[PDB]
Amino acid sequence: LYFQSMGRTLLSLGLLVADFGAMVNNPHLSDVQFQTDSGEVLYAHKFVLYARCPLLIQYVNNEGFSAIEDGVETQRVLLGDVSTEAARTFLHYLYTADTGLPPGLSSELSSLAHRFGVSELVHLCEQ
Amino acid sequence: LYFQSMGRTLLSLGLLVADFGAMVNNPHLSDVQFQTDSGEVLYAHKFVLYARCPLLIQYVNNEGFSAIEDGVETQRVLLGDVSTEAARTFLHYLYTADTGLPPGLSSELSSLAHRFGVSELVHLCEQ
Amino acid sequence: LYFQSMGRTLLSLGLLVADFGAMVNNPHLSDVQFQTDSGEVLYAHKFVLYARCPLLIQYVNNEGFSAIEDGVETQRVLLGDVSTEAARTFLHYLYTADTGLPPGLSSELSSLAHRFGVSELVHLCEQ
Amino acid sequence: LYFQSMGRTLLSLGLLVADFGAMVNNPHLSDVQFQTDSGEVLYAHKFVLYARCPLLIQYVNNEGFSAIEDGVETQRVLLGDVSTEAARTFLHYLYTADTGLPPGLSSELSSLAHRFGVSELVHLCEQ
Amino acid sequence: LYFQSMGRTLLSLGLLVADFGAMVNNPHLSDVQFQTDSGEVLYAHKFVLYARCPLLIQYVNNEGFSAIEDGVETQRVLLGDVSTEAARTFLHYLYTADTGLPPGLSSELSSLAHRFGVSELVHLCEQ
Amino acid sequence: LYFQSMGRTLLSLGLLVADFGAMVNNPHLSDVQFQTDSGEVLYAHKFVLYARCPLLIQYVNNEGFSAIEDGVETQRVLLGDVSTEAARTFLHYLYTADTGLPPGLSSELSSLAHRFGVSELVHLCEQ
């Protein structure tokens, strides 16, 4: 039953990526956030960062700091020299593995990918 | 939504082939049957034969003849010089496009495929 | 030989769906037809309906009636409250498992799918 | 560049599922845990449960309670009438969408899937 | 690890076809060339022709002749009655197996494919 | 016609890899060969090496030397510190992109892959 079986497999995986995609920049259950030079804040989740990107969660733990936002404590991390759109796309990749990266952002993404050791994303950007 | 979309596609196609597979040698709605030299009768359906194999439905219409089985009229067709297992497998291919052909049968199948112009099945058998 | 093997598999399945697609609304070997409220008649084949959709063939057998068209007897079935285009698309799905459903029809299709228990098509329509 | 592109896509998705798979029953960053009738505790992460399974996170929030384990506070939730292996497999599905479910567990899984509205997993279990 | 494994597989194959594609009409290491009726010369490589197309390398060996171009000896072969674009596309297929054939060329390609026994390309052209 | 189209695509690519696979260690049209420390000679083809592996063809051109074998001149290259089986597998990868590498050879292959810059093969070996 190859077609039924592969069909179920792809469908399940598609639901999973849509489900985690809905958590990108989602303040619900967010325990970490990134502030970009524009002042914009991007909500994230240590779960994803730890699971997907050891250098990034290390940076969060070392360079992040306690902040109160709307009466709720979080770990804020400054993420400088990058557009908010590029930062958001980088998080989207960690959450969803989506390879459809906007070509206008490749330079930034590759810089992010490089800084935090996301080899696979470097390759996406070079290609 | 590539994964959801391809998943749904493969799943639907898998159901379709399982559904038509259940009609192979199924006397329900059968309006044609093949008698092999062993005396065994294989039930089939002109719908499939017409849609999938012009040379076979032509042979059915030209060489077939009226027969009564259990009080019900059908078109019986003699299909000589082939094992029942090979004939059954050939019908299975017309109904399901299943390419997993038992290697022990390839010579017979290829002969059937050749006689009735099923090019694609010839190729499966040579390979 | 994965690529040769999967290639042959997809190719065979593609031929099968094209072959059965050519039977949609095809009066040849048609033993059942649907009349829509517009007066348009859609030719079908009990083979497909029985194999693919138990609730639909049950409705055909229970609610259908004998009709003579061009001197030939068939089972006519009234299929009300649905456009001919939606009915035709529903049959196309039963014959081919094609998931590319015209978005303009999704409401009708979903109603058809629901009425005749085609779960998979309900899902296609919701998504 | 279809093959390079689909290759990169599947590879990225494969890394993602392996990365999240490593978080199944992983106490690191765990903010919720399930206690089964055997007394065994399964570590989980509200991030996944919220994103993937609304009925389960609702049950966690409503029926869960504060617990201290090794001096650290978490939300403990009793998950009765199910083997630990079945519970663990259910979490594995929420984290990874893996469809390769051990057949010995299908009855339990289907019961879990049903209770928490994971339609897709019900289907996997029936098939 | 199906997704990682198939991903690596497709990616490797994609690199291979891009690498050999870069050799189409590439004079580097060319030991055979085709002259079309326009006077245009197409560089090729006996390696590919021998491996992929027995009738073509046979024609090269039988009908080709020694030629000096820029002080370097090669085997020149006249390839008449075909546009350079069609000849180039035919070579591209032998080097890369690319099935995306420009529809404007199908008649020529099919003639080439026929003359040199490239069954698979005949089929691409008919379809 | 997705299934017919992808089927044709995979089938063509499968033929291509089988065709080039038949050239691995094939003395026909061989213009370069590798001698391993066991004394065994592996036939190769500069076409492939140039197209697929710049560092390897550079090594061939710089370190290779003229040799006469059975009265025919070739470029012989010493390839030390590696088993013949590992060397042969490395060539097989350059010719076919086959990712199914024998696990017993991964250390050698990775050393070869590293020495000649075949990044993709390094990754196959680490995984």
DSSP D70: T
- The angstrom resolution of this structure is 1.9
Positions of E strands within C1-127: 32-35, 41-44, 65-69, 72-78
- Backbone torsions φ then ψ of A86, nearest 5 degrees: -65, -45
Please give the residue of chain C at the shortest CA–CA distance from B30: C47
User: Which CATH number does the domain housing residue A74 bear?
Assistant: 3.30.710.10
Of B9, B29, B93, the CB nearest to C99: B9
Chain A: residue nearest B18 by CA? A1
- Spatial distance between the Cα atoms of E107 and E119, rounded to a whole number of angstroms: 14
| Amino acid at position B7, single letter | G
Tokens representing residue B65 in the block: 């003849």
Contact list in F for residue C13 (CB cut-off 8 A) is 3, 7
Query: Shortest CB distance from D8 goes to which of A8, A96, A124?
Result: A124
Backbone angles phi, psi at B97, to 5 degrees: 60, 15
Query: In which domain, by residue range, is F60 found?
Result: 1-127
Which other chains touch chain D, taking contact as 3+ CB pairs less than 8 Å apart? A, E
3-state secondary structure chain B: CHHHHHHHHHHHHHHHHHHHHCCCCCCCCCCEEEECCCCCEEEECHHHHHHHCHHHHHHHHHHCEEEEECCEEEEEEECCCCCHHHHHHHHHHHHHCCCCCCHHHHHHHHHHHHHCCCHHHHHHHHC
Q: Determine whether the interchain pair C10/F13 forms a contact, defined as Cβ–Cβ distance below 8 Å.
A: no
Bridge-partner residues for C67, per DSSP?
Answer: C74
Chain E residues within 8 Å of chain D (Cβ atoms): 1-15, 17-18
- Comparing CB atoms, the residue among A12, A45, A97 nearest residue D97 is A12
Query: Smallest CA–CA separation between A89 and chain D, in Å?
Result: 15
Closest CB to E97: pick one of F15, F47, F98.
F15
What DSSP line would sit under chain A, residue for residue? Answer: -HHHHHHHHHHHHHHHHHHHHTTTT--TT--EEEE-TTS-EEEE-HHHHHHH-HHHHHHHHHH-EEEEETTEEEEEEE--SS-HHHHHHHHHHHHH------GGGHHHHHHHHHHTT-HHHHHHHH-
Q: Give kind and range of the element (H or E) at residue F65.
A: strand F65-69
Residues B32/B73, Cβ–Cβ less than 8 Å: no
| F7:C3 CB<8 A | no
Query: How many whole angstroms separate alpha carbon C29 and alpha carbon B37?
Result: 28
CB contact under 8 A, E4 and F127: yes
Which residues, 6 or more positions from B79, have their beta carbon under 8 angstroms from its beta carbon? B34, B35, B36, B42, B87
- Under an 8 A CB cutoff, do E127 and F97 touch? no
Contacts of A1 in chain B (CB under 8 A): 14, 18
Tell me if D23 and A120 make a contact (CB, 8 A cut-off): no
Domain count for chain F, please give it. Answer: 1
